[PDB]
Amino acid sequence: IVGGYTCGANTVPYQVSLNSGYHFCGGSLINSQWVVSAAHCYKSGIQVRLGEDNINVVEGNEQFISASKSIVHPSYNSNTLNNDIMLIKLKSAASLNSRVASISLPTSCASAGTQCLISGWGNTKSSGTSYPDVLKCLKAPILSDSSCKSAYPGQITSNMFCAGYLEGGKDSCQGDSGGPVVCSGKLQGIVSWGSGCAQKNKPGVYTKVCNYVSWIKQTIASN
Template structure:
């Protein structure tokens, strides 16, 4: 189940486009198969995580991150089935849906191999560039996967419990990278394009509405909120798109 109260997009590759890159276009009815989440966290300031974006798609919400003055990174399942005209990014604010600056989407791409949980990544290009300041900055992108036990932080405005209410204030929670083999014993379907993070006892996680948001180690993004079994359950860590593994695709699709 995905980490958002969002939906899936129908995507059709344009003639001559790379088979790894699909433009965002078309639409498809909403399907409730998603979980996002910040559970067990606390309020944080946008100045601490200035790459965090509030991403609305139709009537649904996700997270995203700034990776350059004109490009943002999110999850494929957040945008799959929507047109770019239905999307809006908000930067530079700790408050859900207000403050900061808004940015329409000019174009975007999801991974050509995206299928449900795997390759769950997209990039979108904004029509009006981000103006960098203390509350608006690009995040670094991981080139190597962090080792098991590394402390990482996930942020967003998602629900604070499974099927609960979204937060009006940006929240963050610190979890640890979970060994892929351990994570696979829980889910049985963890690929190299995924990275897992949580706490063994549960109680800390992302949740509905956090999908697409960044998992960071310091100021480097290592994951994108993707899916999991409900939110913050013991022995079921959050599953994230693995930025290091997908780094070359990001560069190919966006030039970043």
């Protein structure tokens, strides 16, 4: 996260870290046994880390649970990142508490101008490289589809939206991929891609979760 702020420990209780020996992506807990992340975060051997603030220190509220299965969206296209969404089932159910809590799925898509909370452990610099240890947060509005497609001509599908600031300075960044965009208490986005980080006229691009609620609910119910 570039240009954001320290969330505060466990203030985003649905935020997970995906670990394969190191943090490599975020995700969002949607029930006791399921996480949603980005398809471009797929790999084998994922451990889901819940209750994290400092990802380099055991602080006493963590749950570490291996994934038992991953399901990449049937139409995921890695060349274009269309349908950049993946479900991860936990080998055992997470213990839900104050600091480990699920986030509701949308019943409706969100409108442009809606303010959302974006979070992650990704790079905090827009030209250099510095990775935080504690979770960072950013408040950012959903941008008009029209400004999104103008920023990225020919690359925005109906399954993507842009959020952030056209002037730059505040954005998601590498290491944030797969993590949440929450608006009005609903998981509306997944950190997907962008051109650099926090650059002018290059806002972050996010998977449009509201298009996938039927697929999410059906897949979970059958697995």
